């Protein structure tokens, strides 16, 4: 399970029809400690008239990212690999219509 690891460390959010804002996710026990996550500005999307269109949806596009967590806790030299979901931006989708 253990390996040797060497350390070797666009206005879209505003211009999108599904705009978003970045939110600070900070964890001192994690590397990267700070992760900037996208949160969709509206439920709907922006139409050709520049207004919010309720019949389209701004949805966050999420991806699995690899993070290091101190193991055991508060140990600066020992870590565990973790997979977390982060929102990197938002997209505009036509909604799903539900019936039974």
């Amino acid at each position: 399970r253990t390996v040797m690891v060497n350390l070797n460390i666009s206005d879209y959010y505003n211009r999108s029809t599904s705009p978003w804002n970045l939110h600070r996710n900070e964890d001192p026990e994690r590397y990267p400690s700070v992760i900037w996550e996208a949160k969709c500005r509206h439920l709907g999307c922006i139409n050709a008239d520049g207004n919010v269109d309720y019949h389209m949806n701004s949805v966050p596009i999420q991806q699995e990212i690899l993070v290091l967590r101190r193991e055991p806790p508060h140990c600066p030299n020992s870590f565990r690999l973790e997979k977390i979901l982060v929102s990197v931006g938002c997209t505009c989708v036509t909604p799903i219509v539900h019936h039974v």
Epitope: H42, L43, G44, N51, N57, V59, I96, V97, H99
Partner: antibody, heavy 119, light 113 residues
Framework: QVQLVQSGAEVKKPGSSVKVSCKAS????????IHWVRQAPGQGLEWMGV????????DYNQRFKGRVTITADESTSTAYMELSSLRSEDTAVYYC????????????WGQGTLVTVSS | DIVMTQTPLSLSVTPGQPASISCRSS???????????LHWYLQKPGQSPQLLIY???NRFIGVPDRFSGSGSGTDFTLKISRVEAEDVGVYYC?????????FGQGTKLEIKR
């Protein structure tokens, strides 16, 4: 079956903030939007805002300015509306409604919540 | 904000007699992808609004056929072929095409028994 239960009536002093809850059941909470609509005594209905419980994405009525905050808790199937800096004019019955894309409007409604703004 | 204007504001109808309510919006209620989000609700005092008609002309499950909807663009009409006692209340038209969603003033229906 499909059901929306709101929190009991409240009395708030001018300038305070009120938080009304809306407990959902009989369906998958995350799959439907929750809207909030109010009605001042002997007055018409007024749309306040909307939440997408799946992502927490919201849209508000500009008339209320930055006074309304709508939120939803996936784990307790409950949506909440928070109206700050209360005025006498904010005395009203507050409703929650779940909308859908087939009907295009609010089918299922909460019972209502009366909020009296008084010192 | 879209303005919804209802005519008349009040009505007193003999049970068995027909009733009609007009709804006119300040702008067309036709959506970019083709649907018309005009709906009709009935509200009984100290009760939540009940859905009567959705998308101009569709009756909601459980709504008797005495209720009917018609119209296009900015002018819409709710018709009741035979008024019944259970019909007492305030009727509202509502648009869900444009944000913020809006309702009419409401029309009060009184039963002339």
């Amino acid at each position: 079956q499909v059901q929306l239960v709101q929190s009991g009536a409240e009395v708030k002093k001018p300038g305070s903030s009120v938080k009304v809850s809306c407990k959902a059941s009989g369906y998958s909470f995350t799959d439907y939007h929750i809207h909030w609509v109010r009605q001042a005594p002997g007055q018409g209905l007024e749309w306040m805002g909307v939440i997408n419980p799946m992502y927490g994405t919201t849209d508000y009525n500009q008339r209320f300015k930055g006074r309304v905050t709508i939120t939803a808790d996936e784990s307790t199937s409950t949506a909440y509306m928070e109206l700050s800096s209360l005025r006498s004019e904010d005395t009203a019955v507050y409703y929650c409604a779940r909308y859908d894309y087939f009907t295009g409007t609010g089918v299922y409604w909460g019972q209502g919540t009366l909020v009296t703004v008084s010192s | 904000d879209i303005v919804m204007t209802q005519t008349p504001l009040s009505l007193s109808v003999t049970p068995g007699q027909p009733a009609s309510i007009s709804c006119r919006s300040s702008r067309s209620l036709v959506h970019s992808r083709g649907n018309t989000y005009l709906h009709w609700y009935l509200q009984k005092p100290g009760q939540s609004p009940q859905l009567l008609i959705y998308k101009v002309s569709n009756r909601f499950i459980g709504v008797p056929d005495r209720f009917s909807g018609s119209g296009s663009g900015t002018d819409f009409t709710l018709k009741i072929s035979r008024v019944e006692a259970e019909d007492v209340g305030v009727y509202y038209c509502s648009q869900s095409t444009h944000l913020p969603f809006t309702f009419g003033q409401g029309t009060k229906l009184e039963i002339k028994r």
